[PDB]
Amino acid sequence: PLHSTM
């Protein structure tokens, strides 16, 4: 659900 920059 939460992640670093795509």
Add this chain to the structure above:
Amino acid sequence: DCHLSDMLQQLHSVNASKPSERGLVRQEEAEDPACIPIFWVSKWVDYSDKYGLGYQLCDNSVGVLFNDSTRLILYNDGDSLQYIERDGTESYLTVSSHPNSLMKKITLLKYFRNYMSEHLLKAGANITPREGLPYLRTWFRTRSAIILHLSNGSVQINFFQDHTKLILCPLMAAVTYIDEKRDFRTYRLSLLEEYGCCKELASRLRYARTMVDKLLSSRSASNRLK
């Protein structure tokens, strides 16, 4: 750990001198490209709600800090693995070899690996790491950033709003700053105390000091359980 205290001391010296409150800031004089880190987190995915936090280091190695506080690392050779228990006890093995008790976690790591590889940008892609594997000791998020603490003493802080990032390396008493344009610069903290820095870097270094204390507090709490 000991590195956290060393880093706190390094940050204190700089912050106490109020580097952005100088007659003429000369930030560029504190630069030292030779202090660029060997390792930093290029990407991460937070699925701590069910399995843990996966991440990739700049050398293409992958890792996962599971919710049970254990870590599994897959080297860039795609086979060598390193497992770290809650204590910190490490064990070396490979995927080829089938350590049955680790097959679930190995499988989970691979899904994390594929996701990061396909959907996320590699931070510091334009940076050539320094010549030489650490694991993610701990991490946490605030309303404005994610804090990552590597087992080699390094502390990385990624800011959500502007995508700027700080990589603090205690051994070389240095800090690498990546701005929103993805430009990067490495500084010796002792030279920043001497020559100063812009208000933005100054603000981030003050916040970093606060984040390092939070890491120490979390460690003191986690110690009470072990």
